Structure 1
Amino acid sequence: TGDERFYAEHLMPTLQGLLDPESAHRLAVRFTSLGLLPRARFQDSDMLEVRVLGHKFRNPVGIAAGFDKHGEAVDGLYKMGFGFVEIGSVTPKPQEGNPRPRVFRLPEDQAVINRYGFNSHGLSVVEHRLRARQQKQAKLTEDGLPLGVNLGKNKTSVDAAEDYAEGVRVLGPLADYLVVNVSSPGKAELRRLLTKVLQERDGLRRVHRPAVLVKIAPDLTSQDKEDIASVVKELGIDGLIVTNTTVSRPAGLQGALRSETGGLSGKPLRDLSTQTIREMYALTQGRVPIIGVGGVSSGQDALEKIRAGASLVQLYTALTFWGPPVVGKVKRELEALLKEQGFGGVTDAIGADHRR
């Protein structure tokens, strides 16, 4: 498209050249929230529809947590063409997060490093924001555009389980799915924590009862992954989000800011994330839905995660470089690749590498 090339080659580089990454983030949220966006003319085909987590998703490409931390831009993100929106992380009480600067761009690597530290308006502010559009969301969800809420914990919390429990009670009734991050940059403690989360979820009225997913880092040992898969199956967790940012620094990063503290996102995370999907799919015998995330910026990227075991994918970093046209780009390329490889639709491709 003309927009894709123009955004990617001219507009987005100029905007990034003018604005530090955090300022750029804020501007993007503000523009999205006001619907000041190019016209998303890609109409989603039936091939892209997925049914998972008790919901219909008109397409499998979502916005990852962190872009819209406080639930300010949900409708604009649907307008951009995302098949689903995840907001958060939201903490129980408002908190400022880490001192600035805390977001860094690695243009040479198509990567970002962030150490925001869960800057959050808090549950109560986000609750009121979602309540203001609750019925609009119900219609969107019914039309195949679900909403996820990522729950965090406060810096000073003396018991993580209570922070997450509070999030379930307050935002669970407003979400199609909730996410508990065991990922932000004993199995018995994870079992305790997730048991408490599921109990709180099960205590919500049936029309207000969300799916619960666990979001993991790519930095886990083999033992950690085995332990997570075991607990997820034992307790009946509804899904996994794979992955958060990495605290590793893969060999070959060129950006001047590569040694900044924080989570690395984007292209250097891509295959690490895909491999983690592949492993978690196998450890859960393909019975636990996975949302695949990390360094997706093309149809090929999306399909590699789907074939590795993802039912859905998310992106964030690619949006910062390519702008809004990236969403339609990924969807269109994914559709073409599905046809080329002989799949009837996304559904047929989920986990296809494991049947090879």
Structure 2
Amino acid sequence: DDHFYAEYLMPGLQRLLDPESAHRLAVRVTSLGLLPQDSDMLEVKVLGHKFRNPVGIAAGFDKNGEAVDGLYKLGFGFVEVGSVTPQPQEGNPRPRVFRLPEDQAVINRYGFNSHGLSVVEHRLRARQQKQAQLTADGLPLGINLGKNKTSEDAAADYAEGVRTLGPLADYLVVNVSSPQGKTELRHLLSKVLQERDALKGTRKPAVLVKIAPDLTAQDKEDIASVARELGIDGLIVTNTTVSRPVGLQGALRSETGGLSGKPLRDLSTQTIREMYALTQGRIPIIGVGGVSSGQDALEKIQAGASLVQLYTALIFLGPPVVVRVKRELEALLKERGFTTVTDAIGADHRR
């Protein structure tokens, strides 16, 4: 029930623990399955895969692939693992996670705390068989690849992620947004796609680029330009923002890092519209940023998203939020004339 979690449970956990401790606890609980129907309307085919429902869990929750199965159990149409780095790295010194309850927002500067490719690969291979079945059933797995803080070759770091986890991923994600020109971007992504095309004995995973909501007009044109030029399979809009919107009440708003949650809701959707227009609706887009209801989800899809993802909403509303968003999205699609989710993609631009 939505009320119990929002009014009591989540608030209870927030007074007993600091955000990073709660995050780790959330992962334990989710991976153990101490948790507990998708219509055909929500089914989305894109990126060469089938998704029973368009609501996935965004990268950052399960950084080391410890709770994949638990996440699907919570109702997610797809799971995106970590932001995994080649070598293990501790990340920024603590505290590095801050709660903004009144804003239904969070601010983090984790710095890519990661177990590493070796560990995540081992874990994911251990369940490769189960995931194979999951994928076949419209529950794809995404893997977000990062790079080490001290690494010298960014492209080499990502490429290594493609080789090690490409065989295990349904789709891969390269960041360029965690809180440089059109040429440096083109070289990085071409080497990644080349490594992807070099894979064998495995189904080639789609490659998407995740961008920040903090981009200049030139940044968006360049990203759109390179994406179409290289044939990027998609884009994830949007990642956290460094800006602090006028109206933030949280006492920790002055904290450095990326802001997620409701404050990022519309900035995320507007970026989706802009990127969708710059790519002429030719590049599938996964919309993320402040999704907390079916309606927020529909606004992202109409702006141009084929799929959406959420994270912060789960932090304050808990598991029930996943069920509520899907239920509302379905009800709204009907009410607004769309026979399927696919029909609403890019509806804003079509007028």
Q: Does 1:275 align with 2:273?
A: no
Aligned residues: 350
State the SS of the aligned residue for 1:205.
coil
2:212 to 211, 217, 228: 217
Where do residues 275-294 of structure 1 align in structure 2 (5 Å cutoff)? 275-294=270-289
State the SS of the aligned residue for 1:25.
helix
Per the normalisation by structure 2, the TM-score is 0.99
Q: Does 1:131 align with 2:125?
A: yes
Distance change (3 Å), C-alpha of 1:206 and 1:229: farther
1:18 to 10, 16, 28: 16
Aligned to 2:202: 207
> Structure 2: any 5+ residue segments left out of the alignment?
none
Q: Distance in 1 between matches of 2:346 and 2:203?
A: 30
Aligned to 1:157: 151
Identity of aligned residues (%): 89
**Cα deviation digits, residues 12-39 of structure 1 (max 9, x gap):** 11111111000010000000000011x2
Aligned to 1:316: 311
Q: Distance in 2 between matches of 1:209 and 1:335?
A: 31
Where do residues 166-177 of structure 1 align in structure 2 (5 Å cutoff)? 166-177=160-171
Counterpart residue type for residue 93 of structure 1: Q
Q: Does 1:245 align with 2:243?
A: no
Q: Distance in 1 between matches of 2:25 and 2:309?
A: 21
Counterpart residue type for residue 312 of structure 1: L
State the SS of the aligned residue for 2:99.
strand
Q: Distance in 1 between matches of 2:313 and 2:273?
A: 22
Regions of 4+ moved over 6 Å: none
Q: Distance in 2 between matches of 1:187 and 1:275?
A: 22
Q: Distance in 2 between matches of 1:294 and 1:31?
A: 24
Counterpart residue type for residue 33 of structure 2: G
Aligned to 2:260: 265
Q: Distance in 1 between matches of 2:67 and 2:5?
A: 20
Aligned to 1:64: 58
**Cα deviation digits, residues 136-186 of structure 1 (max 9, x gap):** 101100000000000000000111111001000000110000000010001
Q: Does 1:341 align with 2:336?
A: yes
**Cα deviation digits, residues 225-246 of structure 1 (max 9, x gap):** 0000000000000000001000
State the SS of the aligned residue for 1:314.
strand
Q: C-alpha root-mean-square deviation of aligned residues, in Å?
A: 0.6
Where do residues 19-58 of structure 1 align in structure 2 (5 Å cutoff)? 19-37=17-35, 39=36, 43-58=37-52
Counterpart residue type for residue 32 of structure 1: T
Q: Does 1:196 align with 2:184?
A: no
Counterpart residue type for residue 90 of structure 1: V
Aligned to 1:74: 68
Per the normalisation by structure 1, the TM-score is 0.98
Q: Does 1:87 align with 2:87?
A: no
1:207 CA displacement: 3.2
**Cα deviation digits, residues 288-344 of structure 1 (max 9, x gap):** 000000000000100000000000000000000001000000000100100110100
State the SS of the aligned residue for 2:349.
helix
State the SS of the aligned residue for 2:92.
coil
State the SS of the aligned residue for 1:355.
coil
Counterpart residue type for residue 164 of structure 2: V
Where do residues 291-302 of structure 1 align in structure 2 (5 Å cutoff)? 291-302=286-297
